[PDB]
Design a protein around this ligand. Structure first.
Ligand code: HEM
Ligand SMILES: CC(=O)N1CCN(c2ccc(OC[C@H]3CO[C@](Cn4ccnc4)(c4ccc(Cl)cc4Cl)O3)cc2)CC1
Ligand SMILES: [Ca+2]
Length: 449
């Protein structure tokens, strides 16, 4: 029958307070006591957590009529939009919409992205000057506002960032979503809604500016290097023949940009922080960069694809500090799990944060040691030993773009700057929807040329 239970402190609320204090420790602490599969009530919700790589297969291999994502991620509706992604009428429709994004993430676009990255950092060093100190998380966020927007939407968006305060609107949207929004989706957030409508109107004009741009220059549609997500959204249909609405298009763009930004700036912060405050790691990374760059002065894609150790550094940081700390599904029918029979209506939960520290998989898991991956292969010990991008049917489709964005920015900054971090490396703050480092995150920098 049912699994072991974390015991209600209180009716209805259940264990929400300890869970709230630190959701990762909550799961680890209840693991050590009640075992790899336990149910805890949290603000109304029968939440059943799966805590070991070895039980995960049925979680990742199920169908969406068995384990639903849309039942648990629909709360994102007032960020994304009605009828968009996890609010689509069907999983079939969500999947098509996820593919309109993916279709701007091609090898030919990726070559152009490295250029965009070079260009936005060029502009950013003018602000930073010959030396100074800067907040790591803020810098990465601010760069990726400009780089993600141009990569997915094309160059036209930039003037909205530069002159119509678009970056401020994103923030207003971003702040209006909360871990709590999962438990209470209908919470008022009039600031968020105002901005969401603001961005809605700006992207509608962006669609409209493009639609005549297509008429004036239809060679664009033949140029694989210039085709972005906006292009694909205007020119594709659903498979069954139906037209997209401009409402759906806007929504998909916003959702895509949200995915394009937070996970990446966070991961890029934790990666860069750990790299620059470890002499050995920094040395290996600089060495690789010297080797790949040779006598060229700027990046290209092919270079980025050779940056294997820098990629292991990033992946080490995802093990330790995964930005999505919990992956979840609603059980639309009872689900069997080992001895147990997880009941209908329960929310199955899997944590990449918890996986990253599991002593079965990783020696000395509190050390940033990328050679645990490149030499010891500790991730391979299980199929789901490492799931920072998920796995199976809904595995992240941004993975390659994220690897590209974060490797490029870091390589570029390392080209420009000597950098040192100030103080000990912080803990994750479990304040936000997407978990990043407890501020502040300061470093000094000095130009090298
Ligand atoms: C370090 C960076 C990133 C991390 C850690 C990450 C993590 C994840 C994870 C864990 C999932 C699985 C969610 C689930 O199964 O419930 C996922 C799905 C997804 N990610 Fe990412 N992601 C990253 C970057 C991106 C980027 C850059 C994009 C798009 C530009 C993106 C788009 C998506 C999409 C569209 C899905 C949908 C998969 C589905 O529900 O079918 N992600 N991501
Ligand atoms: C209370 C608490 O402490 N809690 C921690 C945070 N808990 C949580 C909330 C949401 C969540 O959602 C992950 C799912 C849904 O959202 C994304 C996030 N995402 C970003 C990049 N890749 C995926 C996504 C996918 C595709 C697209 Cl188009 C856009 C996006 Cl935003 O995947 C995962 C976990 C809620 C509970
Ligand atoms: Ca887990």
């Amino acid at each position: 029958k049912l699994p072991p239970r974390v015991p209600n402190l209180i009716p209805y609320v259940g264990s929400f307070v300890s869970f709230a204090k630190n959701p990762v420790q909550f799961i680890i602490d209840n693991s050590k006591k009640y075992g790899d599969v336990f149910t805890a009530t949290i603000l109304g919700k029968e939440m059943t957590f799966l805590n070991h790589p070895k039980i995960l297969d049925t979680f990742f291999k199920a169908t969406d009529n068995e384990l639903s994502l849309r039942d648990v991620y629909r709360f994102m509706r007032p960020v994304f939009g009605t009828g968009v992604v996890y609010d689509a009428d069907s999983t079939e429709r969500m999947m098509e919409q996820v593919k309109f994004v993916s279709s701007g993430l091609t090898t030919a676009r990726f070559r152009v992205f490295v250029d965009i990255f070079e260009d936005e950092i060029a502009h950013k060093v003018k602000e930073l000057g010959p030396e100074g100190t800067v907040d790591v998380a803020e810098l990465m966020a601010d760069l990726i506002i400009f780089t993600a927007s141009r990569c997915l939407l094309g160059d036209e968006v930039r003037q909205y960032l530069s002159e119509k305060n678009l970056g401020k609107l994103y923030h207003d949207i971003d702040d209006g979503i909360s871990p709590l929004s999962f438990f209470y989706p209908s919470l008022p957030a009039p600031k968020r809604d105002k901005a969401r409508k603001a961005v809605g109107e700006i992207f509608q004009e962006l669609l409209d500016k493009r639609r005549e741009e297509h008429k004036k220059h239809p060679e664009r549609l033949l140029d694989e290097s210039k085709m972005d997500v906006v292009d694909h959204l205007l020119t594709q249909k659903y498979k069954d023949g139906q037209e997209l609405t401009d409402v759906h298009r806007i929504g998909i763009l916003i959702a895509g940009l949200f995915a394009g930004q937070h996970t990446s700036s966070i991961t890029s912060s934790w990666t860069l922080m750990n790299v620059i405050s470890n002499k050995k790691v920094l040395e290996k990374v600089r060495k690789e960069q010297e080797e790949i760059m040779g006598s060229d002065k700027v990046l290209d894609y092919d270079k980025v694809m050779k940056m294997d150790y820098l990629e292991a550094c990033m992946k080490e940081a995802l093990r330790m500090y995964p930005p999505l700390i919990m992956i979840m599904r609603m059980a639309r029918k009872p689900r069997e799990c080992e001895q147990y029979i997880i009941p209908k209506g329960n929310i199955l939960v899997v944590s990449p944060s918890v996986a990253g520290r599991c002593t079965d998989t990783y020696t000395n898991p509190d050390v940033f040691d990328p050679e645990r991956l490149t030499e010891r292969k500790e991730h391979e010990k299980f199929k789901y030993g490492a799931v920072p991008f998920g796995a199976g049917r809904h595995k992240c489709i941004g993975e390659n773009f994220a690897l590209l964005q974060v490797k490029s920015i870091i390589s570029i900054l390392l080209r420009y700057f000597d950098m040192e971090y100030i103080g000990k490396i912080p803990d994750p703050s479990y304040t936000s929807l997407v978990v990043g480092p407890s501020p502040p995150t300061r470093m000094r920098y000095k130009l090298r040329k």
